[PDB]
Amino acid sequence: DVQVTEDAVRRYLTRKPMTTKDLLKKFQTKKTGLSSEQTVNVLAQILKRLNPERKMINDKMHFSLKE
């Protein structure tokens, strides 16, 4: 039952950039038990906490950092 958290998204970035859709789509209600919409309602808040750099991954808008 993974939960969408600030610290959880940081690991996603340092590992590989992501888009809001791609960041939330991965979580999904599969385990977090969070609706496809709610998962976003709780992901949007954490996204900004990342404070990464905007870039296009494979022609896709991806915001993230790279250690």
Partner: peptide, 19 residues
């Protein structure tokens, strides 16, 4: 029904780093 799942998906996309 009107699957408005992506509707907000783009809205929150801006609040992040796409204002």
């Amino acid at each position: 029904e009107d699957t408005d799942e992506d509707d907000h998906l783009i809205y929150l996309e801006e609040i992040l780093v796409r204002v």
